[PDB]
Amino acid sequence: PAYTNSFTRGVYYPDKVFRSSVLHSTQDLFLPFFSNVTWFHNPVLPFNDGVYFASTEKSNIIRGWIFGTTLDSKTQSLLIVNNATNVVIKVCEFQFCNDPFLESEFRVYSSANNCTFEYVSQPFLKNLREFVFKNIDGYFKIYSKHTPINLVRDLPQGFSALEPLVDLPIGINITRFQTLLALHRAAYYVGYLQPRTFLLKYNENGTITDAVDCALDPLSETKCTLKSFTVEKGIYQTSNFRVQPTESIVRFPNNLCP
Amino acid sequence: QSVLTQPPSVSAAPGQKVAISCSGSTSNIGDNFVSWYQQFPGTAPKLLLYDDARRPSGIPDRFSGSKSGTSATLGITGLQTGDEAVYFCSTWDNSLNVVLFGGGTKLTVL
Amino acid sequence: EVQLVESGGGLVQPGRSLTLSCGASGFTFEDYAMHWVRQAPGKGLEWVSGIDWNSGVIGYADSVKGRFIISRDNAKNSLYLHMRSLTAEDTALYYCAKDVYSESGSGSYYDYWGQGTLVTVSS
Amino acid sequence: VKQLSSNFGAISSVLNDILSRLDPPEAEVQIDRLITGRLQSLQTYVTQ
Amino acid sequence: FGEVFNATRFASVYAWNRKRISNCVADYSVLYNSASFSTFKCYGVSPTKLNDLCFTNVYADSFVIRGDEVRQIAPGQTGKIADYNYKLPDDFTGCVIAWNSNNLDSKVGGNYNYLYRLFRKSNLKPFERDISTEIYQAGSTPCNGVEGFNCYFPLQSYGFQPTNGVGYQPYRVVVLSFELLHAPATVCGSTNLVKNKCVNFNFNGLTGTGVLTESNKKFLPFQQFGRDIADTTDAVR
Ligand SMILES: *[C@@H]1O[C@H](CO)[C@@H](O)[C@H](O)[C@H]1NC(C)=O
Ligand SMILES: *[C@@H]1O[C@H](CO)[C@@H](O)[C@H](O)[C@H]1NC(C)=O
Ligand SMILES: *[C@@H]1O[C@H](CO)[C@@H](O)[C@H](O)[C@H]1NC(C)=O
Ligand SMILES: *[C@@H]1O[C@H](CO)[C@@H](O)[C@H](O)[C@H]1NC(C)=O
Question: Regarding the domain with residue range C3-121, which homologous superfamily does it belong to in the CATH classification?
Answer without folding.
Answer: Immunoglobulins (2.60.40.10)
